[PDB]
Design a protein around this ligand. Structure first.
Ligand code: SF4
Ligand SMILES: [Ca+2]
Length: 345
DNA sequence: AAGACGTGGAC
DNA sequence: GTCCAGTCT
């Protein structure tokens, strides 16, 4: 019942779509950026980051020419930082290889870093009108209910099935609007919990509603604890010691206060050791937890004084207090410094 | 295939 | 506490 369906949806959308920052226009650059920021992040959280990110990087060219340090800083606190590392690379590519023009061909655009099945569809359909599916979490929840599909949405296979379902019901006339409508619906009406089926504009076509199982869909499956000792080294009144994390793995390329994964009870010994401009640490300042998707950091901050006996090399870099605000730190280490400041005062 | 990969704001 | 809001390997 395509046409019938892809009509009440596009209508509801027309009068119900939220005026979000990235919806001011259909510029591929703006769209691409927002589609990447919204991955595993709520709109409310993203809005401020988007305004800021665009003010700072108005065009793809600006983003491409932008240094990498500045880019991570604009993403500071958003999470899954590899998203911006990939976007920065993909953009640098679009300008050097495609003349600052975003490829409008699924195959071409899909080769860029960070661009997956969903992003290919989202950007190209919303910006260029390419009839490709834009299946994300919200969409799978909506489609699993409309068509009462019980396959584990976690399986790529399931996603593929859903992508097939979209190709057979999308308004090939206006794919872009059709793809957003489906997403808004999942964001505003067909919510994870307590879906507002009574107010939904496509209840007529929903099998899950007819069966009374809407709240049970979609179907999906269901971490490692890690002790971390952190050292805040301060100079004879001034600079503190920090280092740029490895470019691969956890919190890649972000700055942090020197630390070590004790994986046990090493403690101040572990940190005092890693030093090898030596130094010694005092008693802890505070211990707290910080969660990631796949692990939890049980942090322990250790105060300390630095004594210069050599140059600051390797990953390390000496930094004056008033300059820490220039470096991008994970939320975890932003608290390490917060706690530290409310300690010495 | 399924673990890696941040962070926060409803329930 | 729990449940989300995609891509790479
Ligand atoms: S009827 Fe209810 S379950 Fe079906 S799509 Fe609308 S909100 Fe989702
Ligand atoms: Ca791809």
């Amino acid at each position: 019942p395509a046409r019938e369906f892809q009509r009440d949806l596009l209508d509801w959308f027309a009068r119900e779509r939220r005026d979000l920052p990235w919806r001011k226009d259909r510029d591929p650059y703006k769209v691409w950026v927002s589609e990447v920021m919204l991955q595993q992040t709520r709109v409310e959280t993203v809005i401020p980051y988007f305004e800021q990110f665009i003010d700072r990087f108005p065009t793809l060219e600006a983003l491409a020419d932008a240094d990498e340090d500045e880019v991570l800083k604009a993403w500071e606190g958003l999470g899954y930082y590899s998203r911006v590392r990939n976007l920065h690379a993909a953009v640098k590519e679009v300008k050097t290889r495609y003349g600052g023009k975003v490829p409008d061909d699924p195959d071409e655009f899909s080769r860029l870093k960070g661009v997956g099945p969903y992003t290919v569809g989202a950007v190209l359909s919303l910006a260029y009108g390419v009839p490709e599916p834009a299946v994300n979490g919200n969409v799978m929840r909506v489609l699993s209910r409309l068509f009462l599909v019980t396959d584990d949405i976690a399986k790529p296979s399931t996603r593929k099935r859903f992508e097939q379902i979209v190709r057979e019901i999308m308004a090939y006339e206006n794919p872009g609007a059709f793809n957003e409508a489906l997403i808004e619906l999942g964001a505003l009406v067909c919510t994870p919990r307590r879906p507002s089926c009574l107010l939904c504009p496509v209840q007529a076509y929903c099998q899950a509603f007819a069966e009374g199982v809407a709240e049970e869909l979609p179907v999906k499956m269901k971490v490692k604890q890690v002790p971390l000792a952190v050292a805040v080294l301060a100079d004879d009144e001034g600079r503190v010691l920090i280092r740029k994390r490895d470019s691969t793995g956890l919190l890649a390329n972000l700055w942090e206060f020197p630390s070590c994964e004790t994986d046990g009870a090493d403690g101040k010994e572990k940190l005092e050791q890693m030093v090898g401009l030596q130094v010694e640490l005092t008693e802890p300042i505070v211990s707290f937890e910080h969660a990631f998707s796949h692990l939890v950091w049980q942090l322990t901050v250790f105060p300390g004084r630095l004594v210069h006996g050599g140059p600051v090399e390797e990953p390390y870099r000496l930094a004056p207090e008033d300059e820490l605000k220039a470096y991008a730190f994970p939320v975890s280490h932003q608290r390490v410094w917060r706690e530290y400041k409310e300690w010495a005062s």
